[PDB]
Amino acid sequence: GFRGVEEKKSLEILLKDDRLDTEKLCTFSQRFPLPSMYRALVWKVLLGILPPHHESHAKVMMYRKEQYLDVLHALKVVRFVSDATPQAEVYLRMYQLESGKLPRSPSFPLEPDDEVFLAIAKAMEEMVEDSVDCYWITRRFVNQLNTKYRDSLPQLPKAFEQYLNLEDGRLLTHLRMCSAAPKLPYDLWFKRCFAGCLPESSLQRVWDKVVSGSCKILVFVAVEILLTFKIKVMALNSAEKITKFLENIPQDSSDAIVSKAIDLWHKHCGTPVHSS
Amino acid sequence: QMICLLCVRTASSVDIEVSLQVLDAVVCYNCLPAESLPLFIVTLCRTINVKELCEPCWKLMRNLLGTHLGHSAIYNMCHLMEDRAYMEDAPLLRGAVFFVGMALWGAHRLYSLRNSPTSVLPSFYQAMACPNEVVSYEIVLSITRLIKKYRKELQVVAWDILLNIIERLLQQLQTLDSPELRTIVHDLLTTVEELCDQNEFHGSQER
């Protein structure tokens, strides 16, 4: 079955309209993966980097590029960044400047928020080719974590504890016998949004859903992580060993991890339905 | 260093008065060593909270800021307001707020200091990182002076930082429940409104 063709053509129809319906684009992003050629466009549109009207994209990208170059040149002028500075750290400093949270000098150690943004920025670099697009996608994504999900993300660990049992109760019982449930890497999974845990070629399938309003996809991604590694987790026998394994999971099974996490999230939270 | 540690450690306050006099001698007729500047500044921020010694302490700080170490001292006092090791040191934060504000927009402004208020107000905001009635009272008094005097001079960026400060003050009033702070914050809002009426307010009226 050529369902990939159906998905791509439906998205091209959603993108053909002179006004892009962000609600339909969100529902599509929930229900299907984004083709890689339209992922940056659709992420820009849902993150509000580009407005719904397609005509306005040229001028708004001029605005975004001007803002990016102005902030970057300013960081160069106050010597906060340099040409050697990694692109992710450049994005971190640009975000700090734009949010008014720039330190006095780059030698000031990173705050936890800074490391979280840096991790998401590193992951974005591999997903988005263009530096301006990558920076804007990164900043809007992290801002969604701090604004659209400031209350939802803290609930995610409990949702993990719930759905983990609901798919294999004995597995969560195995974890709680180790009393390792509060020591699982929730800051990685839900503040850094699996940046640095999954390869970006499949972390992007997660982030399609995170952009389109779903941070529970993160819960199900973690759940499918532990379901995929049942053979290993049921052989794990210590809280610290579990914590270290979960921060460095084998990356080979990650494509299937995210695919089955999306399947699980479509099974437990239902299939998205187009509005009438 | 020895006189500053005296001021920090002394039980007697006349000792602090003559210490401020000796430091005035060091600042005026000699050179304050640039490496003694942070401890000197911390000492004055501590001393400016003693009621009987504010006038000598402010005169000493003004004389120091009249030397070549003035911009360095303003930057150090903003560093004190921003450093996390001093979040709980309320008297020192209050003193730094008082000093930076009095030097840059007080009646005793040093017109030798080239710094716009924009450069130091983020430090005022960070001085309120840990809620403290007296620190916020000094913040709002200093900002009241800055606004009531330099409303025309205050451009949009200065008003951004001032509105962020007023927002953090209004947050604190949900928890400090202090009537003197509440009164001057709401008077400050009323003056900002009057500046909107006179069209001398250049900030974001939306915010």
């Binding site: 102005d70 300013a74 010597r79 | 451009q155 949009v156």
Partner: peptide
């Protein structure tokens, strides 16, 4: 909004030239 941006761009340009001069004097 464009004029606001251009005016603030010029203000930052003056400060940028001041910063480059002050750094040059270091």
């Amino acid at each position: 909004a464009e004029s606001r941006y251009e005016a603030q761009k010029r203000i930052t340009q003056v400060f940028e030239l001041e910063i480059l001069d002050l750094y040059g004097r270091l």
